[PDB]
Scaffold this motif. Structure first.
Motif, PDB file in Angstrom:
ATOM      1  N   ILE A  14       0.896  -1.161  -0.045  1.00 38.51           N
ATOM      2  CA  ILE A  14       0.116  -0.039  -0.086  1.00 38.51           C
ATOM      3  C   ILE A  14       0.887   1.141  -0.022  1.00 38.51           C
ATOM      4  O   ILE A  14       0.494   2.144  -0.525  1.00 38.51           O
ATOM      5  CB  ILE A  14      -0.940  -0.028   1.230  1.00 38.51           C
ATOM      6  N   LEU A  15       1.921   1.171   0.735  1.00 44.58           N
ATOM      7  CA  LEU A  15       2.821   2.457   0.750  1.00 44.58           C
ATOM      8  C   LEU A  15       3.279   2.712  -0.539  1.00 44.58           C
ATOM      9  O   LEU A  15       3.705   3.739  -1.045  1.00 44.58           O
ATOM     10  CB  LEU A  15       3.905   2.422   1.610  1.00 44.58           C
ATOM     11  N   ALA A  16       3.355   1.634  -1.453  1.00 46.28           N
ATOM     12  CA  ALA A  16       4.073   1.779  -2.918  1.00 46.28           C
ATOM     13  C   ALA A  16       3.098   2.143  -3.795  1.00 46.28           C
ATOM     14  O   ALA A  16       3.295   2.987  -4.718  1.00 46.28           O
ATOM     15  CB  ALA A  16       4.681   0.345  -3.283  1.00 46.28           C
ATOM     16  N   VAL A  17       1.756   1.977  -3.391  1.00 47.69           N
ATOM     17  CA  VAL A  17       0.684   2.425  -4.163  1.00 47.69           C
ATOM     18  C   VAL A  17       0.467   3.906  -3.749  1.00 47.69           C
ATOM     19  O   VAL A  17       0.513   5.026  -4.627  1.00 47.69           O
ATOM     20  CB  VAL A  17      -0.761   1.732  -3.967  1.00 47.69           C
ATOM     21  N   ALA A  18       0.161   3.929  -2.336  1.00 49.67           N
ATOM     22  CA  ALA A  18      -0.202   5.417  -1.864  1.00 49.67           C
ATOM     23  C   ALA A  18       0.781   6.394  -1.955  1.00 49.67           C
ATOM     24  O   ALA A  18       0.464   7.540  -2.447  1.00 49.67           O
ATOM     25  CB  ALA A  18      -0.341   5.066  -0.228  1.00 49.67           C
ATOM     26  N   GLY A  19       2.112   5.992  -1.991  1.00 52.57           N
ATOM     27  CA  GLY A  19       3.327   6.880  -2.083  1.00 52.57           C
ATOM     28  C   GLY A  19       3.291   7.256  -3.471  1.00 52.57           C
ATOM     29  O   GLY A  19       3.517   8.575  -3.813  1.00 52.57           O
ATOM     30  N   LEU A  20       2.850   6.529  -4.582  1.00 48.91           N
ATOM     31  CA  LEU A  20       2.909   7.018  -6.035  1.00 48.91           C
ATOM     32  C   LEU A  20       1.727   7.883  -6.386  1.00 48.91           C
ATOM     33  O   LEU A  20       1.694   8.534  -7.084  1.00 48.91           O
ATOM     34  CB  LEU A  20       3.017   5.735  -6.998  1.00 48.91           C
ATOM     35  N   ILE A  21       0.547   7.326  -5.661  1.00 51.29           N
ATOM     36  CA  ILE A  21      -0.678   8.244  -5.714  1.00 51.29           C
ATOM     37  C   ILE A  21      -0.427   9.807  -5.185  1.00 51.29           C
ATOM     38  O   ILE A  21      -0.783  10.869  -5.445  1.00 51.29           O
ATOM     39  CB  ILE A  21      -1.701   7.694  -5.177  1.00 51.29           C
ATOM     40  N   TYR A  22       0.315   9.484  -4.037  1.00 48.10           N
ATOM     41  CA  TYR A  22       0.824  10.746  -3.142  1.00 48.10           C
ATOM     42  C   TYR A  22       1.376  11.558  -4.049  1.00 48.10           C
ATOM     43  O   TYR A  22       1.367  12.970  -4.052  1.00 48.10           O
ATOM     44  CB  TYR A  22       1.635  10.141  -2.109  1.00 48.10           C
ATOM     45  N   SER A  23       2.327  11.048  -5.077  1.00 50.47           N
ATOM     46  CA  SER A  23       2.930  11.962  -5.995  1.00 50.47           C
ATOM     47  C   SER A  23       2.169  12.246  -7.272  1.00 50.47           C
ATOM     48  O   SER A  23       2.328  13.158  -7.712  1.00 50.47           O
ATOM     49  CB  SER A  23       4.205  10.952  -6.510  1.00 50.47           C
ATOM     50  N   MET A  24       1.451  11.102  -7.397  1.00 49.79           N
ATOM     51  CA  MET A  24       0.613  11.304  -8.816  1.00 49.79           C
ATOM     52  C   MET A  24      -0.395  12.353  -8.630  1.00 49.79           C
ATOM     53  O   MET A  24       0.048  13.291  -9.641  1.00 49.79           O
ATOM     54  CB  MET A  24      -0.574  10.147  -8.746  1.00 49.79           C
ATOM     55  N   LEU A  25      -1.180  12.847  -7.552  1.00 49.46           N
ATOM     56  CA  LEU A  25      -1.857  13.735  -7.658  1.00 49.46           C
ATOM     57  C   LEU A  25      -1.176  15.214  -7.651  1.00 49.46           C
ATOM     58  O   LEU A  25      -1.790  16.246  -7.870  1.00 49.46           O
ATOM     59  CB  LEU A  25      -2.593  13.807  -6.127  1.00 49.46           C
TER      60      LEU A  25
END
Lengths: 46, 46, 46, 46, 46, 46, 46, 46, 46, 46, 46, 46, 46, 46, 46, 46, 46, 46, 46, 46, 46, 46, 46, 46, 46, 46, 46, 46, 46, 46, 46, 46, 46, 46, 46, 46, 46, 46, 46
Positions: V32-43
């Motif tokens: 999840i941190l690998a997803v959330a982190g990229l989403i965290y950056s995505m946005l």
């Protein structure tokens, strides 16, 4: 009657000197670990 | 009486040399990490 | 009357020298434990 | 009288050599920890 | 007298080979971190 | 007494070569990022 | 004597494949950043 | 002793090829922006 | 031994779809800039 | 070792098509400005 | 990989219609200037 | 696994409407430039 | 999601009125050029 | 006691030269974008 | 009784000098990235 | 009966002073890493 | 008959006081390692 | 110690050539807008 | 090292042809205003 | 008179062999803990 | 006389097998922490 | 004689399963941190 | 023997839900910068 | 087991409001440049 | 939780006033070119 | 918060005076063409 | 004459069974420590 | 003869239950560290 | 026999509550960093 | 048993206030950049 | 417990003054561009 | 004949209860080490 | 018979209180690490 | 019985003050990073 | 008891001065970017 | 204590001179744009 | 310290010559406009 | 705390003089265009 | 600080001479039109 542990009392001190003595040299060796270990850190950190 | 830790005292120093000695060579190896790591940064930064 | 423990008094010193003597050799061996043990740590720590 | 710990004195050195001897081999192994550990970091850092 | 650590001396090298050996495999894995990490950046930077 | 870290001292250098060695190849890879990144800029800027 | 890191040597390659493997998927994602980023500019520039 | 980073050294080159490789294709995409942008100008200017 | 990144390989594609997906919406917005910008000029030029 | 950016290399081309593609349609729109602007002039000049 | 600018390509045409469209109405207004200006001349010349 | 950009896909259209929307108002203003500019000429020419 | 350009849509009309407004005053001035110019001729011709 | 970082102090400057050295090369390359960018503009402007 | 860490107290400062000493060298090297980085930017910006 | 550990009680504090004393020296050395580390960062960051 | 260990019973407590007494001193010294250790860490961490 | 950026120094110039090289081509293309623009004007003016 | 912009150099000329090509067409259209304008005058003057 | 402990003297050595003999076996078993312990650590550390 | 520790000598090896045997199992379990730990890091890093 | 660690050998594998088992769960969470982190950056990025 | 990490296996997923859950909220907040940033630009550009 | 990020999930939206809120204010300020810029042009053009 | 951008919201309007304020002054200056330009023409035309 | 463009508001008028000032001079020069032109005609006509 | 330790010889075995027996149950308890201790590590490490 | 360690054998199991038992509750506490630590990361990372 | 770790088992839970408890308050503090950091970005970005 | 982290729980809040507190003052400073940056634009644009 | 960021809070304001301060002087310089640019226009237009 | 260890058999259980009894209190103390130790880590980790 | 560990049972609780007691003070100190560490980041991040 | 950690309880607060104390000084330094960093941007942005 | 961070408190200010100090020099350099950048525009605009 | 940024303060001026220096050369080039641009107009206007 | 922009200063003159150089050729072309334009009039007027 | 932008504030004025300065000389050159252009008209008109 | 536009100020005059210079030669050519045009009239009128 009694038991003349007269010289035997002070005798304990004779070995005692040895006790204090040996330590300095081990602890002098221990000191390397405190240098080398901080050097081990130094080359990565600094 | 006592305990003749006479040579045994100086003996501690014998190992001590080893203690100081080994360190230089590890720390000489550590140094690569400080070069390579700054090189690792260098090629991205500079 | 009495009991002539004249030579037998000093005789106890005969054995004593050996008491002092054996110790040095054992303690000489014990010393490796203090080197090795510290090198045992050296190689993980340094 | 006394106690002939003549050969037994030098005898302690017999074992001593082995005390010195085993250390080198263990410490030789410990060395991998210092390489691997630093390569363990190498591959993340460098 | 002494203590026959004859085979036990070379014995320490037996383990040593394994100390050298395991490292390569771990370090082989660590390598991915250096590729991926740089591709992790590659895809944002390049 | 002491501890014969004689070959063990120079031994540290053995790994050290490895330390200097691995770096060149990572840094040779790093270099792509400095080319590709300036190419990434080049095609927009020039 | 020695230490049979026979299977454990090749064992490190077992993990390695996974090190190579995960990268492709991440880098596959990173690729969007290179498209989107360039389309992000595309729509202002072109 | 040392650390056999023999194949590991040349290994860095293995990834390096990838580094040079990926770039050509991004930069091949970048090129569109340099055409389209001059086309974007062309239709207003020429 | 190895490391079963079996599902985790294809797992990276799960995220990928979203990488492709978000782009279209942003780029859909960017498009207004290309219309408006050209109408921004349209009303002065035409 | 290396990093299999095999499909990833050709992958860059996949987006590239998009890069060439979008342009034609913007530039097809640009063309209006070159007509309308000359029409804007035409009705005053001719 | 690539970037699905599929609908986005034809999308450019959507605005394009607008581009061709607006022009007719400006140019329809321009036409007054070509009439009125020749009328402006007409009443002095004819 | 994947990444649920389900609502976030359509979400991009939310902003899009506003991209279309603002343009009309600006372009409505730009229109004055096309009237005034032509009346600016009208009063000298006609 | 979307982007509430609700008031900002009608907001563009706020400026529009001023676009219509300024024109009348300029065009009111331009009118003198059409009188004077024709009186400029009037006094030579009539 | 202390830690003889005598040559390791000046050793830092050994690498330093490298740090200052590499820069000039990259900087020399960067200069082209400052030329090409102005030429990129020159040909449109001049 | 106590433990005469009299010289060992000040001994700590012996190494301390080293700690402060090494830093300046590395810091002196670090400075190049602060120059090269700005030059790295200078050539693009200026 | 009892055991007169009268002076041996306070004797413990004799060593205690040593315990508190040594720390300051090491702590004083440790401080350099807190400076050098921030300088190590300063030169890259600032 | 019995054996009058009347005062010898309470005599045990005479020594007991000593047992509880000595501890506080050593414990007081031990406390320095709890401080120095945290300071030892403080200077690196904080 | 230092860091042998000997060939990497001159390596920077390897890319530099590229930087100067690419420019001429783009610049050569830019030149058409300087011709076409003047022809674009020529046909109206001359 | 360098950056193989070998084909990308000549690639610039690929587009260049386009730059010179488009111009002739527009220029050919511009020519009508040079004719129509003179005819526009011809009919009043001649 | 005396007591013929002639063969009983050397008889002591008969058992002695046993004393030296048994040790090697146990020692050989002990060695596993020295391996297993390091492997026990290897798997966590390496 | 002596003491027939004939079979008891080799008996030591009976247990020895056990010593070497148990290790592999634990070591096999330890391996999971080496995998899980890297996966534990993988998911954050990669 | 020996020591029947027959079932205790395989017993080690009983726990091993646990070691491999637990990891997947944590690893699954780490993802999840690998997803959330990229989403965290995505946005921010996209 | 083994270690019953039966429920602790699935327990990992208990937290996992949390990991996926938190992200959406932050991601939802991040989205504002993607709107505000474009509005931040909208008002200058459009 | 799990991790009760129940309120912390919705907590994310607490800040979110802020994110959407701040934007309107800045956006409201940005609008002046869109007015002032057109007025900046109005006074020269109109 | 959230982020109290309560006053910072309205704070945006604090600057906004400035944005609207400055414009009038510049606009007031711009007006001279609209007068001077027409006078610049007046004196030749009228 | 806001932005104190207090004096900068009125500052705009500082330049404004200049704008109105310069015009009169040029306008005063322009007047000669209005005289000279009529004299240019006077001498032929009158 | 002799001493009939006939049954007494085999009798020793009777207790021996007990000797082997008790061990399994202690060692079965020991095993918890090897599980729990790795679990103690597991929950921090994994 | 022998030694009836009959109940004593099974007795070892009695404590063993305790051994397995205590662990679950420590490890249940350990689990907090794995949650809180990922929460500690979560609030910075996500 | 066994060992009554009855209350001791549930006792572990007593501390466990503390484990879950402390976390909420650290993580409540962590949250500031996620607000302030986005505020830190907000004032530059928005 | 348990661990009375009673005040320690609320203690986390004590620092938390500090966390919220410091932010306002940094962000109050950030605000200058948003004013000055728009002023930096203002004096060129308006 | 908490963290006394008492003076540290107001401290942020200390720098803030600097933030507001520097701006006036840049913006005072910006103003030249608004004068000189209108002067640059003035000498061609007026 | 025999020996009436009738009460003395059960007598051994008298002491046994105390063997079970003391353990709980010690183990109750040991528990703090498991809390504190984990809070010792808690405050660094969490 | 038995053994009156009556007071000695509750006696273990006497020490227990101190086990609970010391923890709070240490953990109170550990807390600074959690504040400082987060302020250590605060000042770089916020 | 118990254990008089009376003064040792409050003793932990002695160290605590220092935990609070050191932080302020470090955080005072960290503050420069927040000024400089923002001035680092100031001079490019403003 | 406590921990005498008396001089170490003020010690943090020692470093602080340097934090304030370095900034001025960097910011002094940054200033050129603000001059040059504005002269970079000056020479095109003015 | 403090941090001797004595030479490093003035060091920042070293770079400063270069900041002032490069500008003149760029601005010297920019000057051509002001000549050519005005001659670009000269040849149409004059 | 400083930054050796020694050659880079004079380097700016290298480009300068080209700035002077290109102008002459463009201005040479512009000249035709001044001839043709005047012959364009010549043939109507003369 | 704050940031001593004391001299840096007035520093902005230093460049400002340059800003006002350069303008006079460009504008002195602009003036030719206003003379030559009226001369260009003069020789046809007068 | 400031920006040494010292020679750059007088530099503007360098081009200025050119500005005054070119004019005389165009205007010398203009003069033909004033002769030839009056000659064109002369041969019809006189």
């Amino acid at each position: 009657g009694v038991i003349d542990t007269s010289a035997v009392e002070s005798a304990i001190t004779d070995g005692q000197g040895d006790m204090k003595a040996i330590g300095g040299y081990i602890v002098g060796a221990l000191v390397i670990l405190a240098v080398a270990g901080l050097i081990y850190s130094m080359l990565r950190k600094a």
